[PDB]
Design a protein around this ligand. Structure first.
Ligand SMILES: CN(C(=O)[C@H]1CCNC1)c1ccccc1
Length: 315
């Protein structure tokens, strides 16, 4: 509208184009998902693009095989001023996309299933460009969903408090309308969080447990950093010995970049004198490796290992 109106309402090009994509998704899910598929293809530097006939007929396996052939050094590796902000932008786009879709579209069984299936497929590609782009996308996706789960939890607590105040207020009285709405609201929100847990499982089992072991050091670094982020954000789901294995194991990685990430992840956990209890078996298992890395070889890795060890000591 007016210049004052557009300034007082700071929609970035990303927020604006995610809002347009959502309007497009509501008119025609198929062309919207086709554009979202093409986005992830273009973001790998792949020169091909999927048309509706391929989308509606061909499996993701065939689409990826056909797009693999159309490959001429991809956006995420590019040096130059015109690609500086790409990684940061690509990451924020996925956050904005899912933040916006979090109350309706995410729970439709079509959109998240399409993306995750494409990303899982591209994460199994021989092409480094596809594996790098899809994995970083999946890692930021999981974190977007973890924030969705965090938001649900708040609404679940308020729906719970409201049901408690009504369940009490009745007692000896036939369960009125308000108590049946609240009892249904509460089922819905838990059923919503099951679907989020479901999507997180597909991403973890499909992408993470394969990509954290990837040939490319930067792909291993991307995975480790983000399981670190999930473990801090969403302690009860992600902070356990099964998931911690991956981070702790990777302390033996051959590259400074990756060993540096493992320590930064553990650092953020051990600062919180609260989930320190849940790190007791892990500290016992990997004290030797953590402690050894204080004289790592890579100065900066050693500095972090020392900072980690001084955090473990103080607790
Ligand atoms: C590496 N590790 C394991 O034993 C794996 C395999 C079975 N449980 C998880 C471990 C031990 C203590 C604390 C965290 C992880």
């Amino acid at each position: 509208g007016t210049l004052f109106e557009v300034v007082k309402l700071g929609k970035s090009a990303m927020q604006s184009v995610v809002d347009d994509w959502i309007e497009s998704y509501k008119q025609d899910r198929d062309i919207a998902l086709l554009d979202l598929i093409n986005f992830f293809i273009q973001c790998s530097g792949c020169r091909g693009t999927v048309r509706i006939e391929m989308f509606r007929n061909m499996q993701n396996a065939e689409i990826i095989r056909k797009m693999t052939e159309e490959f001429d050094d991809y956006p995420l590796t590019m040096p130059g001023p015109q690609w500086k902000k790409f990684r940061s932008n690509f990451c924020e786009f996925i956050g904005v996309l899912i933040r916006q879709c979090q109350y309706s579209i995410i729970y439709d069984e079509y959109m998240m299933d399409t993306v995750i299936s494409l990303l899982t497929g591209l994460s199994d590609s021989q092409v480094r460009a596809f594996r790098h782009t899809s994995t970083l996308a999946a890692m930021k996706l999981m974190t977007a969903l973890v924030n969705v789960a965090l938001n649900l939890s708040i609404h679940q607590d308020n729906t719970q408090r409201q049901y408690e105040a009504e369940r009490n207020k009745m007692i000896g009285k036939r369960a009125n309308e308000r108590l049946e709405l609240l009892l249904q609201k509460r089922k819905e929100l838990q059923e919503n969080q099951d679907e989020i847990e479901n999507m997180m499982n597909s991403i973890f089992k499909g992408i993470f447990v394969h990509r954290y072991r990837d040939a490319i050091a930067e792909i291993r670094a991307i995975c480790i950093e983000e399981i670190g982020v999930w473990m801090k954000m969403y302690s009860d789901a992600f902070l356990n010995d099964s998931y911690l294995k991956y981070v702790g194991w990777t302390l033996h990685d051959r590259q400074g970049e990756v060993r540096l990430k493992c320590l930064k992840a553990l650092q953020s956990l051990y600062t919180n004198r609260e989930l320190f209890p849940k790190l007791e078996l892990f500290t016992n298992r990997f004290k030797d490796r953590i402690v050894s890395m204080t004289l790592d070889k890579e100065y900066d890795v050693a500095v972090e290992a020392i900072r980690l060890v001084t955090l473990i000591l103080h607790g």
